Amino acid sequence: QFEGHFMKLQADSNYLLSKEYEELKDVGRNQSCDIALLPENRGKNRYNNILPYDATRVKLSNVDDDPCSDYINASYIPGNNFRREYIVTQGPLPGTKDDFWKMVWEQNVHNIVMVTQCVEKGRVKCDHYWPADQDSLYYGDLILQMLSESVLPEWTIREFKICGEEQLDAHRLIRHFHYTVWPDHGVPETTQSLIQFVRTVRDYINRSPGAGPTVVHCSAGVGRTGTFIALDRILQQLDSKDSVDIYGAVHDLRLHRVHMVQTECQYVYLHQCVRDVLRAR
Ligand SMILES: [Cl-]
Ligand SMILES: [Cl-]
Ligand SMILES: [Cl-]
Ligand code: NA
């Protein structure tokens, strides 16, 4: 079973756990990121070393006169159910926030997951890319209105109405799930916190059939974002199988985007979450 597997991984000061994590290090990394490296796109990446692969990047519709107008730092990611179950992205920049909302619109996104604060330890990690109040705003040609904001202990849930300017009756409801307690150092203090957050989000995702991919982001869109997605996938497997494959999930993530589950600590945390679920049952 899982508990015995994890016991063996943790034996000898996590020796086999480390070895397994290190086996994933080169996965996916021979893939080109030439589009992301075009000079015209340079300002559109938050981090030089976190770029989407050409094979898996999300494309925006082209705006005439600008061939590089298709670019956003964003990647498609598989889950248990669909090949493009998620779109992962960086925390938007002031200059990419209209692109972000354009992607949300064009990809039929109904659910957005944000696993960061805008500022952490005095560093800007993500722009405040959504409305501050209930007054509506255009991001490019898209109209956005916050209908509700619910500040809970460990997350904030917001509802937005989005529509194109030239068709006001064809609007969409979008939910935004903002995990607000990820600590400045390490991983969350409890497994309970991220497990409950993931299950909360999943229960909303299951009630949005016909939606496009779920957007997940943090600052770079790799570590916390990858941990969120891996956890979502493995908790579904547990509920269904119950046959958990944490290694396989992280491997598949790495094929789609660099650094997904970016630290060994996050990889350990995934194993702890699953153990804790099983212990509670
Ligand atoms: Cl290049
Ligand atoms: Cl699939
Ligand atoms: Cl798909
Ligand atoms: Na692609």
Author numbering: 1687 to 1967
From the paper:
Also within this category are RPTPγ and RPTPβ, which have the secondary pocket with a basic residue albeit with bulky residues in the gateway region. The basic pocket is also found in the phosphatases RPTPγ and RPTPβ; however, the topology of the region differs in these phosphatases in that the gateway region is inaccessible. PTPs with particularly high enzymatic activity against generic substrates were RPTPσ and PTP subgroups R5, R3, NT1, NT2, NT3, NT4, and NT5. CD45 and members of subgroups R3 and R5 were extremely promiscuous and dephosphorylated most phosphopeptides with reasonable activity. All members of the R3 subgroup as well as RPTPγ were highly active, and it will be interesting to establish how this activity is regulated in vivo.
Protein tyrosine phosphatases (PTPs) play a critical role in regulating cellular functions by selectively dephosphorylating their substrates. The ∼280 residue PTP catalytic domain consists of an α/β structure, and biochemical and structural studies have led to a detailed understanding of the catalytic mechanism (Barford et al., 1994; Zhang, 2002). Key features of the domain include the PTP signature motif, the mobile Trp-Pro-Asp “WPD” loop that in the closed conformation positions the conserved and catalytically important aspartate residue, and the phosphotyrosine recognition loop. Here we report the crystal structures of 22 PTP domains, including two tandem-domain RPTP structures and a detailed structural comparison of this protein family.
